[PDB]
Amino acid sequence: ACTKNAIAQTGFNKDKYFNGDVWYVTDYLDLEPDDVPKRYCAALAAGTASGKLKEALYHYDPKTQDTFYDVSELQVESLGKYTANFKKVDKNGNVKVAVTAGNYYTFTVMYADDSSALIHTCLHKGNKDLGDLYAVLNRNKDAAAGDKVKSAVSAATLEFSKFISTKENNCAYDNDSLKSLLTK
């Protein structure tokens, strides 16, 4: 179960974050892991599509090769804090698993600038027991985390040394499909 009420960035610039470009997860902190894929890859695109906040997601397990895509409309709770009911889609946006109540994640942008971000998410999927996940994002795949986002990790009272890197994972990303999924 999740335990954190993440605080959104003061002065969060929604149009800059939700600009249609891709964010790569470079490092993450799961407060409730199991044995787990310590090795894992994720990226998202965040945009506005004909006046709706949207996110497209891409997950790739570099060992199992398990790959899946999602699209969500984000509903606003407050500036920088959203609730996202997701649908699993193929890369072209065709629905594989419809939106359903109880399949949602929350999404809080704790820090963002033009290149980097720190987010919190709490995923709810069926009767699954999931915990808090923090992710360091970058516009450039595998970029080393800079001092602004690392300071934000510290300011959240987290230890960056505890985050797991995705940079050494033989990750590959379908960023073109993320971009096009925004409309789906």
Residues of the binding site for heme: 59
Distance CA 85, CA 77 (A): 13
Which 3 state secondary structure label does DSSP give 159? coil
Judged by CB under 6 A, how many residues of this single chain contact ligand HEM? Answer: 22
Dihedral angle sign, alpha carbons of residues 131, 137, 141, 146: negative
Site for ligand HEM contains 25 (CB under 6 A) = yes
131, 2 Cβ separation under 8 angstroms:
yes
Site for ligand HEM contains 56 (CB under 6 A) = no
Q: Which is nearer to ligand HEM, 70 or 132 (CB)?
A: 70
77 contact partners, CB below 8 Å, separation of at least 6: 83, 106
Report the residue from 105, 111, 134, 163 that binds ligand HEM according to the rule CB under 6 A.
105
N- to C-terminal Cα distance for the chain? 30
Site for ligand HEM contains 20 (CB under 6 A) = no
Site for ligand HEM in 108-167 (CB under 6 A): 119, 121, 123, 125, 128, 133, 135
Least Å from the CB of residue 46 to ligand HEM: 10
67, 59 Cβ separation under 8 angstroms:
yes
Tell me the window of 10-18, 23-31, 141-149, 153-161 that interacts with ligand HEM (CB under 6 A).
23-31
Which 3 state secondary structure label does DSSP give 179? helix
Q: Which is nearer to ligand HEM, 79 or 164 (CB)?
A: 164
Q: Which is nearer to ligand HEM, 57 or 149 (CB)?
A: 57
Which 3 state secondary structure label does DSSP give 150? helix
Least Å from the CB of residue 119 to ligand HEM: 5
* Breaks in the chain after residues, C-to-N cutoff 2.5 Å: none
Binding site for ligand HEM (CB under 6 A): 25, 28, 30, 37, 40, 42, 44, 57, 59, 70, 86, 88, 97, 105, 107, 119, 121, 123, 125, 128, 133, 135
